[PDB]
Design a protein around this motif. Structure first.
Motif, PDB file in Angstrom:
ATOM      1  N   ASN A  67      48.893  54.980  47.099  1.00 58.00           N
ATOM      2  CA  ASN A  67      50.010  54.827  46.179  1.00 58.00           C
ATOM      3  C   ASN A  67      50.465  53.385  46.027  1.00 58.00           C
ATOM      4  OD1 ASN A  67      50.496  57.610  45.374  1.00 58.00           O
ATOM      5  ND2 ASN A  67      51.203  57.952  47.489  1.00 58.00           N
ATOM      6  N   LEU A  68      49.704  52.419  46.550  1.00 56.03           N
ATOM      7  CA  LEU A  68      50.006  51.039  46.253  1.00 56.03           C
ATOM      8  C   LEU A  68      49.315  50.629  44.958  1.00 56.03           C
ATOM      9  CD1 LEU A  68      49.527  49.620  49.853  1.00 56.03           C
ATOM     10  CD2 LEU A  68      51.655  50.554  48.752  1.00 56.03           C
ATOM     11  N   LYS A  69      49.593  49.408  44.492  1.00 52.34           N
ATOM     12  CA  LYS A  69      48.917  48.942  43.280  1.00 52.34           C
ATOM     13  C   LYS A  69      47.541  48.362  43.612  1.00 52.34           C
ATOM     14  CE  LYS A  69      50.310  45.336  41.150  1.00 52.34           C
ATOM     15  NZ  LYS A  69      50.759  44.252  40.221  1.00 52.34           N
ATOM     16  N   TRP A  70      46.494  48.925  43.025  1.00 51.88           N
ATOM     17  CA  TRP A  70      45.127  48.424  43.190  1.00 51.88           C
ATOM     18  C   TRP A  70      44.684  47.712  41.920  1.00 51.88           C
ATOM     19  CZ3 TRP A  70      40.958  50.326  46.711  1.00 51.88           C
ATOM     20  CH2 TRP A  70      41.477  51.001  47.855  1.00 51.88           C
ATOM     21  N   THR A  71      44.205  46.479  42.061  1.00 49.90           N
ATOM     22  CA  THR A  71      43.684  45.753  40.906  1.00 49.90           C
ATOM     23  C   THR A  71      42.228  45.503  41.203  1.00 49.90           C
ATOM     24  OG1 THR A  71      45.819  44.684  40.414  1.00 49.90           O
ATOM     25  CG2 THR A  71      43.834  43.701  39.460  1.00 49.90           C
ATOM     26  N   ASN A  72      41.345  46.076  40.378  1.00 49.44           N
ATOM     27  CA  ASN A  72      39.931  45.827  40.615  1.00 49.44           C
ATOM     28  C   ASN A  72      39.586  44.413  40.200  1.00 49.44           C
ATOM     29  OD1 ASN A  72      36.836  46.095  39.307  1.00 49.44           O
ATOM     30  ND2 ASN A  72      37.200  46.929  41.378  1.00 49.44           N
ATOM     31  N   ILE A  73      38.885  43.715  41.080  1.00 47.84           N
ATOM     32  CA  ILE A  73      38.380  42.368  40.764  1.00 47.84           C
ATOM     33  C   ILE A  73      37.012  42.461  40.147  1.00 47.84           C
ATOM     34  CG2 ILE A  73      37.916  40.006  41.692  1.00 47.84           C
ATOM     35  CD1 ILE A  73      40.860  40.918  41.879  1.00 47.84           C
ATOM     36  N   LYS A  74      36.112  43.189  40.792  1.00 48.82           N
ATOM     37  CA  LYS A  74      34.737  43.419  40.350  1.00 48.82           C
ATOM     38  C   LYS A  74      34.220  44.600  41.163  1.00 48.82           C
ATOM     39  CE  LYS A  74      32.760  39.982  43.451  1.00 48.82           C
ATOM     40  NZ  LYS A  74      32.220  38.618  43.455  1.00 48.82           N
ATOM     41  N   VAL A  99      30.464  29.989  25.034  1.00 47.40           N
ATOM     42  CA  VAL A  99      30.338  30.635  26.342  1.00 47.40           C
ATOM     43  C   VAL A  99      29.506  31.904  26.141  1.00 47.40           C
ATOM     44  CG1 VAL A  99      32.585  29.730  27.108  1.00 47.40           C
ATOM     45  CG2 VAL A  99      32.451  32.004  26.142  1.00 47.40           C
ATOM     46  N   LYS A 100      28.876  32.383  27.217  1.00 47.60           N
ATOM     47  CA  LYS A 100      27.964  33.515  27.094  1.00 47.60           C
ATOM     48  C   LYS A 100      28.669  34.780  26.621  1.00 47.60           C
ATOM     49  CE  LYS A 100      24.115  35.861  27.927  1.00 47.60           C
ATOM     50  NZ  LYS A 100      23.344  35.661  29.200  1.00 47.60           N
ATOM     51  N   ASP A 101      29.865  35.048  27.162  1.00 51.22           N
ATOM     52  CA  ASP A 101      30.505  36.363  26.978  1.00 51.22           C
ATOM     53  C   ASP A 101      32.008  36.143  27.165  1.00 51.22           C
ATOM     54  OD1 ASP A 101      31.388  38.928  26.888  1.00 51.22           O
ATOM     55  OD2 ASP A 101      30.097  39.657  28.592  1.00 51.22           O
ATOM     56  N   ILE A 102      32.701  35.910  26.046  1.00 55.40           N
ATOM     57  CA  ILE A 102      34.126  35.643  26.119  1.00 55.40           C
ATOM     58  C   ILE A 102      34.885  36.834  26.724  1.00 55.40           C
ATOM     59  CG2 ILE A 102      34.401  36.424  23.665  1.00 55.40           C
ATOM     60  CD1 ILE A 102      36.372  33.565  25.499  1.00 55.40           C
ATOM     61  N   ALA A 103      34.307  38.047  26.665  1.00 55.53           N
ATOM     62  CA  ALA A 103      34.918  39.210  27.289  1.00 55.53           C
ATOM     63  C   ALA A 103      35.039  39.112  28.812  1.00 55.53           C
ATOM     64  CB  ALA A 103      34.116  40.474  26.953  1.00 55.53           C
ATOM     65  N   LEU A 104      34.349  38.163  29.452  1.00 56.03           N
ATOM     66  CA  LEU A 104      34.480  37.951  30.888  1.00 56.03           C
ATOM     67  C   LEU A 104      35.750  37.202  31.254  1.00 56.03           C
ATOM     68  CD1 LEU A 104      30.697  36.906  31.576  1.00 56.03           C
ATOM     69  CD2 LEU A 104      31.843  39.132  32.060  1.00 56.03           C
ATOM     70  N   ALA A 105      36.595  36.854  30.298  1.00 61.38           N
ATOM     71  CA  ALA A 105      37.698  35.944  30.608  1.00 61.38           C
ATOM     72  C   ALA A 105      38.680  36.542  31.613  1.00 61.38           C
ATOM     73  CB  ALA A 105      38.446  35.535  29.326  1.00 61.38           C
ATOM     74  N   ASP A 106      38.937  37.861  31.517  1.00 59.60           N
ATOM     75  CA  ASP A 106      39.902  38.482  32.435  1.00 59.60           C
ATOM     76  C   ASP A 106      39.373  38.449  33.861  1.00 59.60           C
ATOM     77  OD1 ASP A 106      41.705  39.047  30.395  1.00 59.60           O
ATOM     78  OD2 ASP A 106      41.265  41.171  30.336  1.00 59.60           O
ATOM     79  N   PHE A 107      38.065  38.720  34.032  1.00 65.21           N
ATOM     80  CA  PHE A 107      37.412  38.615  35.330  1.00 65.21           C
ATOM     81  C   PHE A 107      37.485  37.193  35.835  1.00 65.21           C
ATOM     82  CE2 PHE A 107      32.857  38.501  37.333  1.00 65.21           C
ATOM     83  CZ  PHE A 107      33.397  38.582  38.615  1.00 65.21           C
ATOM     84  N   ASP A 162      29.589  32.312  34.236  1.00 60.48           N
ATOM     85  CA  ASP A 162      30.018  32.654  32.872  1.00 60.48           C
ATOM     86  C   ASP A 162      31.465  33.164  32.823  1.00 60.48           C
ATOM     87  OD1 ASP A 162      27.510  31.923  31.679  1.00 60.48           O
ATOM     88  OD2 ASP A 162      26.709  33.957  32.035  1.00 60.48           O
ATOM     89  N   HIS A 163      31.964  33.807  33.880  1.00 61.23           N
ATOM     90  CA  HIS A 163      33.345  34.278  33.779  1.00 61.23           C
ATOM     91  C   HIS A 163      34.325  33.125  33.890  1.00 61.23           C
ATOM     92  CE1 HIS A 163      32.828  33.868  38.042  1.00 61.23           C
ATOM     93  NE2 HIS A 163      33.764  34.722  38.437  1.00 61.23           N
ATOM     94  N   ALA A 164      33.984  32.081  34.664  1.00 60.55           N
ATOM     95  CA  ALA A 164      34.797  30.876  34.698  1.00 60.55           C
ATOM     96  C   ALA A 164      34.805  30.170  33.360  1.00 60.55           C
ATOM     97  CB  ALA A 164      34.259  29.923  35.771  1.00 60.55           C
ATOM     98  N   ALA A 165      33.630  30.013  32.735  1.00 55.01           N
ATOM     99  CA  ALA A 165      33.589  29.405  31.393  1.00 55.01           C
ATOM    100  C   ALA A 165      34.451  30.187  30.405  1.00 55.01           C
ATOM    101  CB  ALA A 165      32.131  29.325  30.923  1.00 55.01           C
TER     102      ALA A 165
END
Ligand SMILES: NC(=O)c1ccc[n+]([C@@H]2O[C@H](COP(=O)([O-])OP(=O)(O)OC[C@H]3O[C@@H](n4cnc5c(N)ncnc54)[C@H](O)[C@@H]3O)[C@@H](O)[C@H]2O)c1
Ligand SMILES: NC(=O)c1ccc[n+]([C@@H]2O[C@H](COP(=O)([O-])OP(=O)(O)OC[C@H]3O[C@@H](n4cnc5c(N)ncnc54)[C@H](O)[C@@H]3O)[C@@H](O)[C@H]2O)c1
Ligand SMILES: NC(=O)c1ccc[n+]([C@@H]2O[C@H](COP(=O)([O-])OP(=O)(O)OC[C@H]3O[C@@H](n4cnc5c(N)ncnc54)[C@H](O)[C@@H]3O)[C@@H](O)[C@H]2O)c1
Ligand SMILES: NC(=O)c1ccc[n+]([C@@H]2O[C@H](COP(=O)([O-])OP(=O)(O)OC[C@H]3O[C@@H](n4cnc5c(N)ncnc54)[C@H](O)[C@@H]3O)[C@@H](O)[C@H]2O)c1
Ligand code: NA
Ligand code: NA
Ligand code: NA
Lengths: 468, 468, 470, 463
Positions: free
Chosen positions: C351-358, D7-15, D84-87
């Motif tokens: 029930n905590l906030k989880w933010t997926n990084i990858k 950049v390769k994939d601007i959709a990677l920006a959030d990552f 690419d996500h940094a770019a």
């Protein structure tokens, strides 16, 4: 008027006592064992014949046994391992000891025999052994006394011929039936080291073992601490004090990768050598390779390495042909129990020049030289001070507990004329006694965690076959 | 009929010669220097006064200088660092040496003065110094001889009192103008260690330096080898021989993370200790943290480390307050050049019990104890044998080349009354001389590659600001 | 082949990449490859129907193809939801071997796939199990117990995975012919079990007398426990942490819970990579080993505010609690390298906030805004965030597995293996090590007969007593 | 409405933004520099053309420069080092960046040229360079524009032919005098890496260097940290991700034992390899031997190592003759700045089989194979993620301070930051890793001849 001892110089006792005091602080397991069993006196009535390197650490063991009630006679189990100030402190405490650093082989064996002429009459009733030499004297004498005597004229090494001569002298001088008398009275032997334990299992396999034995070497808190960390600390200590060479930049060869060879290779690598290893056991060879050591034969290593160390417990590891091929002033030494790992005898027609005690330069016809340490006997004990006190506290707490088992806790014949190991609860206890000194904070399982892994919260924590 | 020496026991000379011979094999840089310059005799006519730990390694240096033509007088630069068998061998070779392990501070300073009463009369014309004490005697005497005597009445320590008394005695017992005559005749000084070089630059910057100086410490093949790898090998050697403690499991604290502190921390970690470091320089502190050491203050470490080593070249690093807070039987020692890193004088109203030479137990009123090594003087040299020969061959090849530079290559006054370092070409040559002995196979730049990076195939290979 | 659909993988198009890395791994797995060449002509596993439950990695693919080359019919699943390497699974499916294994499958999928092992193609059941962690073994034994009428345990789940497992058992009882689990148990000739946690499960059953078929404990081959558990984790723990986080390890403090074989390897992984490592232990011998190796031995309560990285390596439960995690520094890294995800109290975080990084990396935020970085949701980090152990050390583990399958399937005609737990003989343990020496340039010395007599051994081994610990 | 980027994939920006946030926590020197200098705006008016591996760590540097006031355009300095996500995150932040992992050499040089077409018109007035490529574009164009154009018809490599074609194209398309206009406006360059600094001193000694330069590489807190510890962490990371081999049991050969070779040898030995080293410098060779490494020639190593790494900054270190002699499936890679340490060109006649991005198997006529990482380009950045953030914080705090010095505040045209700044960089990193620094008392400071606040060492001290 106490005179029942042979040491270098009794005047060294005050120095010995100072270093024993220092070692006590470093040996919490022995000191805690005194505190626990002192009041119960479990060794009262024990007459312990000890054959074990007469070091400062052994002196703390001896006084622990005595604090538990034992009557004691002691010798060293190597001609170069005695620390004369330790020996003198024991003699000054009124305990018979026969131990000099640099005694001859003839003296060594005559001293071993003196263990069995108990002061006031009679024989010992316990043996505490490192390497099996006191045990061997009793068994060989008993073999001959029962009429099997031809083996006493079998060709042998110089020391072997001295040993057989000793047995003949004792058969001739002691009352008939002396060895059977000794063997009857020995309630048990506890044996410290890999080579002595192998000798024990051979006797048990042949049915000739005369009394119960505890194999102290194969306590986990002995084999994986003394043989490993002890040599990691003391092998390079011996090499440095003998030679004062720079180890960074040198190549070292270690024969064997059992517990001592693992510790020995680490000692040299940590000190800066590039280390190669030989092995005959493919599992141990694969371990060495996975630890980053090049695994080679001694023939490959002989012209390559600067420093050679035998750590096998076997014989004929470094031969005259290897030493013929070594570079000029290569260093050679042995950290296994006995001096036949190196073919020392084959070197005796070459020119030897002594440098200092336990260091000799040996010159071949082609004028190349090798530097030999302790004439091929245990280098850590001969050229330095053996293992340091703290790890000997673990070994010697095991020894003290094994003496108590064999002398005091065998009233239901739970030890037959066979070879036993201490139970894991006692092995774990030995470790527990050492944790506070070095600042370990042990976690306790909660009940449901103990249940989850199927152990009691107080241990034992591992199965019988666990290898640590 | 040669009597112009003071050593502990001249009968140790044969043992010294055997270990000198063994060190020669380990010192290929010095031996190669003898072979190169022997025929040219570049030091013919030099009268070298040496003040430098009178070890076996120094004996190989002394005999190298003599092989190049030098007349020599020698003393140790520390009261516990002499190896008496090396001193005896030098005396037996007919070279005046005044050096005893365990000499008093008064003897130490009287012996330093004997450097300057050259045999046959006259003075030296070169100084080879480690720590700057011989150089200081000349400069302080000169200062007072010129009329500025007031400083002689304000001694800040017992050592300073003995030294100022010595200067006063020489002003009365040596001819008028003796210090100016020495200063005139000294063509140069070469100085071995970080502390001595600091003192040289102090004098140079103030314009009081009396003759040219070469800073040997800051040869790359000195500071990044001797101070680093030498201490890596010899710090734990000193602690083991003094105490025989187990290092695995112990916590050690090293003050300083310069060249000596880097080598000292590595000595202890490689031997099994968990090592903490203090530093005042944020770059050195960040290095230590990146090498995995916890970086703490001495106040944080005082109650909890088992072993303390000062490696700073600074003063008042371990104080009476730190020592009061230490655990019972903590070990304290110093590997910096001078003893005032530890407040030894602050201990002199406590109970001291000598254990053996260079080992003392000091007891506080509350009964806790500490173990002090070499009364706070250089522990590697006082409790063991200093650095091993191979690395000292690099330091001492630099010293020989520096003596050649000042004595023989200053015809054009390329060396004024300032501090210089040897050129990188010589630094590279010193390293080159040591490669074959340890089996290094150097690559040669192809011509295209040398051009590509803009160096000559023969070097030098790095810019003058390269840090290695 | 077009007719073959009996698999579930992430993407069959990954098969060509899978095959290239399998080829590379073959060079690095000399023991497995030598075992093929030796036993291939003899076909010792012809007639074997092997149900395998073991991380579907490139290394496992070389094991699978070894078993097939020795004659085995095979069905396979992974033993963890994040450990599959999808290109390895695709290559096995493209070889026409049924495999049900996806990196990131759900717990429900995981257990439905385990059950598919037992629906043998063409009818019938397996006759061998090759297990890592005991899950396939547990399905047969739990179903048997319930089918014999003891169903109380099924109604009392105490974790999400347990309730899914219990619901699977109920479903199979509902859907399969009556007596299905007893028919499976009758046909399984043996199980070989890879890992410490699975072997604990085996000895518990053998001690209760409930073990249904012979078992070989492969974990306690010397050439498994002292190599895979130790050197494998030494190589792959820091690989997982680096791939997940890309942090600088030099300058960081790490805490390892446990100093058994995996904890020893884990602590060395981190120390060699530059961390200052602290260890916890409950066993005083293992604690004394850690202290002798230079590690500070502390409790998890002492470590919780101090360390930058936490690794559980115990095989036990409830090692890192919500209380520990609340006390940690912001953005401390937490992970697990023991077999199961209850070393860390992951459920307490849900029930905590989880933010997926990858994939396999999450930031968990407490109400007070304090954060931790969690790897692989507390599942095996080396397999989840990286590629598990490297091939060479898996060759030793999987050569043991192959030899154990040959023992149970082909060398039990005399019933030398009863319904209890066995280890391989030391001569076979030694052979496994021998097979790996030439590839890494080891030259083994030969004992002369006098030297072998002197230490009481045969020149050809075994070289050590039964109780030798290495 | 911003598209001035590639950049390769601007959709990677959030990552990318999530990993930039994480890296900020790990980069206390950069963040402290933003805190101190942000409100001072020392780079207001700066137009910085950056050419430096476009990683997550470089993004934190870029956003630091921007927080100090700078206007920025950016490219990577290697074709495989971009993350690419940094770019994508930098693009999304509105900063022109032209950087794709796997861009071709043609794209690489086209992108470098885009640094100089400043948005809104004009040219940059600062360069931040890693390897000297942006600097070299200016100088080569300037040389040709002053009439000396014959060298452009004489390239030595495929890359140099692409570079020279670019210079020709710019001389044809841009206004007459464009390179002189750029050179006039560049206030200075700061240069990150050993190879780029070697190029600067070449130009300074030939008298052709067109503007002041700061040698950032030889800050103590760059060379003795990034080159050493950074490679210690990231070399084995690259090899593991490319090959997943077991390192225990293997023999590795490292060519060079300067700062990168020292770090590289340590990376491999700490990971379990038995490591051999080559050197041409007898002092560095003696250091390697005293650290316990066997020092051998590449010819000695070729038939017996499992893994080869070049770390020299020189060329033709691993030749086709060495690779012909290697064992089957030996691993070969380069951690020096440029790919010509390995003779990759000579391999182009053989059969290449791609395994995955940045991993190729090359087969010889006799059928033995080698495994090549990143086509011989920097392996830590090509096969993994370069150095970790914390050590790059030290390098990039030096870069930020150097940009401030050149832009806002000697005799030599190439110089280094003063030791007080070097010390400051280290001080900024101590609290995050738990270091407690001791403070000298006044009498202790006097005793060793330093001020309590430093600097603590002489300018010739080597650390
Ligand atoms: N000096 C000390 O303080 C010290 C400490 C403990 C034990 N020891 C002695 O050390 C010796 C070794 O003991 P250990 O406990 O390591 O025994 P171990 O059985 O664990 O190891 C010995 C190793 O030597 C190997 N070996 C045998 N013959 C060989 C050969 N010809 N070439 C290469 N390798 C060979 C074996 O395969 C084995 O792995 C024994 O004599 C023991 O008593 C000495
Ligand atoms: N025993 C030997 O064989 C041996 C060998 C070489 C040098 N030395 C001596 O060792 C000493 C150190 O030499 P070095 O070459 O390492 O010098 P260095 O200048 O390289 O290092 C000394 C370090 O001490 C640090 N420091 C100074 N004051 C401190 C304090 N109060 N607390 C913590 N750290 C402090 C400095 O910041 C510096 O980094 C000198 O006296 C030198 O002459 C001894
Ligand atoms: N990820 C992998 O690749 C891999 C490799 C091999 C095994 N495994 C798994 O790793 C786990 C450990 O295996 P192992 O072989 O090291 O087992 P082990 O029994 O050798 O070691 C576990 C250690 O944990 C200690 N311990 C138990 N509870 C503890 C507690 N509450 N706090 C601190 N210490 C505690 C034990 O005393 C023991 O020494 C098992 O789950 C095993 O299946 C994982
Ligand atoms: N990949 C990275 O992240 C990274 C990090 C820092 C710098 N670099 C690059 O690494 C390279 C090396 O940099 P450095 O700082 O270590 O330079 P350095 O000058 O400190 O070291 C290079 C070493 O290579 C040796 N050498 C030259 N030719 C040789 C040969 N033919 N055989 C063996 N040795 C040879 C030199 O003697 C020198 O000691 C440069 O190209 C630098 O730009 C890469
Ligand atoms: Na001792
Ligand atoms: Na793998
Ligand atoms: Na990175």
């Amino acid at each position: 008027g106490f005179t029942d001892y042979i040491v270098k110089d009794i005047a060294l006792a005050d120095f010995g006592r100072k270093e024993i005091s220092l070692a006590e602080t470093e040996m919490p397991g022995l000191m805690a064992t005194r505190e626990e069993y002192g009041p119960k006196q479990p060794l009262k009535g024990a007459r312990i014949a000890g054959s074990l390197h007469m070091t400062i650490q052994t002196a703390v063991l001896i006084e622990t046994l005595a604090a538990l009630g034992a009557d004691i006679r002691w010798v060293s189990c190597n001609i170069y391992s005695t620390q004369d100030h330790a020996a003198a402190a024991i003699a000054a405490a009124g305990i018979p000891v026969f131990a000099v650093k640099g005694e001859t082989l003839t003296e060594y064996w005559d001293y071993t025999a003196k263990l069995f002429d108990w002061h006031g009459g009679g024989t010992p009733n316990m043996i505490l052994d490192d390497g099996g030499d006191a045990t061997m004297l009793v068994h060989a004498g008993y073999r001959a006394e029962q009429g099997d005597t031809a083996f006493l004229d079998k060709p042998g090494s110089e020391e072997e011929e001295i040993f057989y001569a000793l047995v003949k002298r004792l058969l001739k001088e002691k009352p008939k039936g002396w060895f059977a008398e000794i063997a009857k009275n020995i309630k048990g032997v506890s044996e410290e080291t890999t080579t002595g334990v192998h000798r024990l299992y051979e006797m048990a396999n042949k049915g000739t073992l005369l009394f119960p034995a505890i194999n102290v070497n194969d306590s986990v808190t002995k084999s994986k601490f003394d043989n490993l960390y002890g040599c990691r600390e003391s092998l390079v200590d011996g090499i440095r004090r003998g030679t004062d060479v720079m180890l960074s930049g040198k190549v070292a060869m270690v024969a064997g990768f059992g517990d001592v060879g693992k510790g020995s290779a680490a000692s040299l690598r940590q000190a800066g050598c590039r280390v190669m290893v030989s092995e005959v056991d493919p599992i141990c060879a694969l371990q060495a390779a996975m630890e980053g050591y090049e695994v080679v034969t001694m023939e490959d290593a002989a012209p390559r390495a600067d420093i050679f160390v035998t750590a096998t417990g076997n014989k004929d590891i470094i031969t005259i042909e290897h030493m013929r091929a070594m570079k000029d002033r290569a260093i050679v030494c042995n950290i296994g129990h006995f001096d036949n790992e190196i073919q020392i005898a084959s070197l005796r027609n070459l020119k030897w020049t002594n440098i200092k005690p336990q260091v000799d330069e040996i010159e071949f016809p082609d004028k190349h030289r090798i530097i030999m340490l302790s004439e091929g006997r245990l280098v850590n004990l001969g050229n330095a001070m053996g293992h340091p006190s703290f790890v000997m506290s673990a070994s010697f707490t095991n020894q003290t507990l094994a003496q108590i088992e064999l002398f005091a806790n065998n009233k239901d014949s739970k030890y037959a004329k066979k070879v036993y190991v201490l139970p894991k609860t006692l092995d774990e206890k030995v470790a527990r006694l050492h944790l506070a000194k070095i600042g370990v904070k042990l976690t306790e399982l909660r009940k449901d965690q103990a249940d989850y892994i199927g152990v009691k919260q107080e241990g034992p924590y591992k199965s019988d076959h666990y290898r640590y």
